[model samples]
Target: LPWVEKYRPETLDEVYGQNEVITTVRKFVDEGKLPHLLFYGPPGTGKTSTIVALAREIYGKNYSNMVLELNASDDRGIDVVRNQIKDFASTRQIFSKGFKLIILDEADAMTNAAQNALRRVIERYTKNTRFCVLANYAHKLTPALLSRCTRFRFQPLPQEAIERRIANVLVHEKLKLSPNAEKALIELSNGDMRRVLNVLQSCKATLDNPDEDEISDDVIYECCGAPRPSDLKAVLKSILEDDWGTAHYTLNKVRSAKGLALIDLIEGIVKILEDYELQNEETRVHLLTKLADIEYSISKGGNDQIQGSAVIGAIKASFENE
Candidate 1:
């Protein structure tokens, strides 16, 4: 059980990258004077992890008692919000500094009406509790609530930071990893620590011996269905060349046999696009704009086959001049 949860960093000091934000937060924790904070960042970067770690550091093992977690996506009504706050914060503090913490995960999902109600609750409960709103986009948060909090924007993890964390996990798991295999993991994760750890852990689970001298790149690739950067480029090249047979075969080979969802395929295409170098900035911007449209379409529940076909067509059109 300990090994299963082993990759979770226990302290703020252990979090990777975002050095400026970490330093500021560390000082706040040390000084024992933390204000209500809004943590904004891309997914899988340690936003939630950092908040949990901070709460653990502040309240010791009993942190969960003081922390009330709410998922705005799950509880969409203002009544739910009000009830949760009242129940979580109505009790008297065990001591003077015992302030209850409300962690709203995906807080941006709260509707404008719900947000307005939340603002009132926030104002009414400011004295006995603190709010920690976690969101991928700060712009989605209500302006009034945002004004009442200190905002910290988190950046994606850097390669070095992710490598260091992955190494620590491998060491603790007593598993050896080849240099090339390690490189592949880092490349595929694209600096997401959760993805990195998860990829490594999944690889470990299928190994015959937990103490294997070294895991292979095959295992890593199998666990995470992302093709190598070059392979992804090759697939795009074939697709752009209008070689339908090769494109279809490549797609089938690269996609997981269990199921190749259209959304995942589109995401793979986006990742490949990130590695491309356009001759001019304008062309790059145009390609990105088209990719954004594809993303929006997929997000809005457009039919996968239709969306995927449109995406492929757009890619072909964009690279015609190349």
Candidate 2:
């Protein structure tokens, strides 16, 4: 089974981050006063999963019977919304004494036409069916629907929370995860729990001795196709410290050996630059501007080798002036 699905939080307590959202949702469940909910946030931050889990908590064995999943992106046609959504929500005739949950998945992609039909359904079914509109961006939703539901902004998971979850997965899967490799996974995840698990699985899949040997940073970085900090440091040192000819040579050498694109270098290098504590900031902006141009040019069908030289010159000259 996919680790993501296998390790999905069965109860809300098992979920990490977005605690306030969970707290309020838990309150609603406890009070038996669940409202029309609008959950907006980045992907894999537990918007849909929370609602799904909420439904299970509310209905227990009758979870499937109470919850209706509709991907707005896939099924947002006018007729589908007016007919199907309305049909599902209007459960007046032989029904159990419970409010059904209609999960409007990917509500950000919901069209204006669908919104009105959805709004009407929400208004008409306020007694028996509860609408939980899930989206990544909330501003795209009209004020009509926004006002109708209690909005909950699901934040990206914190680094600590991500690591905790990652460690839990490692323990359950019985894989020996190295400290440095764990750091790389957390850094690369950028607070997306799903990305962390997916990358970990992908990294382990290619390992020769998945269980016998430890998961090192090299394997993690290589699997994720990201430059290791050590490699980034080498590139950074070459550009910032080496003279023009030597800088250019080292940049190209690393690029060729690592099969790294110019953008990757710039991406990693800019981050390394940020780590520098400058009492007075000057060359940072200058170098960044030049770096952007190299990236812009590369994206626009320009020569990477020449632009590679340009990056070397940019860092060299940026420091030269001040």
Candidate 3:
């Protein structure tokens, strides 16, 4: 059991990434002066994990009794919010000097009425309880609510931090992955730690030989239902070199591996092309526009293969400068 959850950080210092927020949180823990907190950031970036760790730090062995976690995304309404607060906050302290914690996950998704009700709850429970609101968008939270809490905006984990954490997991599991396999996982996860772990664990479970030392990028690609790196690169390379026939063939073959919608493909392609060190800006913009058009067509229920072919045709016509 310790193999997985045991590696979870017990202290703020041991938690990876979000260095700035963690530093402030450490001060809060030391001073025992935790204000109402609002943690805003992308998913899988340790927002929820940090709060859980903080709760443990604050209450020590009694955290389970003091903490109340609510998910606004699942139960969102003025009535639901009011009921939760009334129930949780109405309860008296289980022990002397014991404080209460209320964590509202996805708070930004709450309706306007629900948010207003939450604001009232925040005021009513300010004496013995601390409120922590977790959101992806800070602006979506009402100003009244926002004014009451200490806001922490978390950043995506740096690649080094993400890689280090993944390496630690691999070491404990005694799993060996090829060098490029790790790179592929990072690229696929795009700085999301939970996504990385989920993908890796799923990949591990489906392996033919669980005891095998080395897992390759091919395994990762196949498991993810994504095109092989060489296949994807070949399509891009052919387009760059103005090999229309080869590009078309490569596109057709890899099109089946696009499990996500065509719009998702365009989005991923835009990110890839932005990172591409192209000498010609016009060519890059032109290709992106063509890809964008294909996405638009797909959004309108256009034929996927035809839309993909249109992308290929645009790529061949636009990159003539090369």
Candidate 4:
């Protein structure tokens, strides 16, 4: 079984992080005052999970009948809003007493024309249906559509909560991972549990003996096709502490050996910088912006060696300014 789906929280209690959301939502369920919902957040954060879990708790056996799910795969046209969504909302079950759920995943994908149509649909179906719009960015949604729902921003899972879930996942799968390997997963995963699961699951088959074979930091990094944490740390430490020629040698050594992309290096460095704070916040900001420029230039077919040096130079200058 795909561990991500298999381990999805069935009940709200099973859901980790987003306690503010969970507590508030619990009141809605208990008070029978569930509002139209706008859940905006980063991918693999619990936007979809929370609502789905809520519907399961609220409707149980009638889950299928009560919930209409639409994702980005579906066509997003005024026609869909008028026909499909309207049809779903227009119908009602004699057996079910409360309102039905229409979950529009990637609602931000719907353009203004369709969103305008949805604005009307929401009000028209207010008596019998509740709409939940899921989006990665709330700003993409039209203000009219946005006004209808109570907006909830799902934050990236906290480090503490994420660690707890990863521990439980390891325990259940009987997987062995070193602390460095685990922390590397947390670092790479950055708040997305789905990514964490997929990374772990991708390496599942690599182990010959589940009893004896253990996953290491390199394996986790290898599984994700990202630069190894230690290698990245070596590069970063060199950039901050060593002379230009030595820093360049360390970075190029890792880059060539691992076949690491320059952007991923920038990405890896950015993630790593979360802890190693500089005395000057602006210098850190300046460094990140310059990294972004190098990244952008690289994506546009800029020379890797040049950008690599630019990266070394940028880091040096940012610190020099500080």
Candidate 1 overall lDDT versus native: 0.75
Clash pairs (backbone) in predicted model 2: none
The candidate that achieves the highest TM-score relative to the unseen native structure = 2
Task: List ranges where model 2 is wrong by over 4 Å.
Answer: 17-19, 22-36, 42-49, 56-62, 71-86, 97-99, 105-129, 135-150, 292-306
Q: State how far residue 87 of model 2 sits from its true place (Å).
A: 3.8
List, residue by residue over 206-316, the lDDT tens digit for candidate 3: 877767757789888877766555655666676667566776666666655555445655565565666676677788778877887777778889677778778777767
- Global lDDT scores for all candidate models: 0.75, 0.80, 0.76, 0.83
Sum up the clashes in candidate 4.
0
Candidate 3 off by > 4 Å: 1-6, 17-35, 42-49, 52-65, 71-84, 94-99, 105-128, 135-150, 237-250, 257-261, 271-277, 303-306
TM-scores for all candidates: the values are 0.66, 0.77, 0.75, 0.75
> What TM-score should be assigned to candidate 3?
0.75
- Predicted candidate 1 versus true structure: per-residue lDDT over 1-322, tens digit per residue: 5343566656656666665766677798678677788998766567777888777767787676888888888865778678979988896665635778899888888888887888788889988888888887899888988898899988877777777777778777787999989998877776666677777778778888868557878778778965555555666777777565666656656554535565666666787777777776766666678878888878888676566556666776677645
Clashing pairs in 3: none
lDDT of 2 by residue, 111-173 (tens): 776677678778987888888998878899988888899988877777777777888888887
- Between candidates 1 and 2, name the one with more favorable TM-score: 2
Tens digits of per-residue lDDT for model 4, 178-252: 999889898878787888998888877787787577898888888888787677888989999999899999999
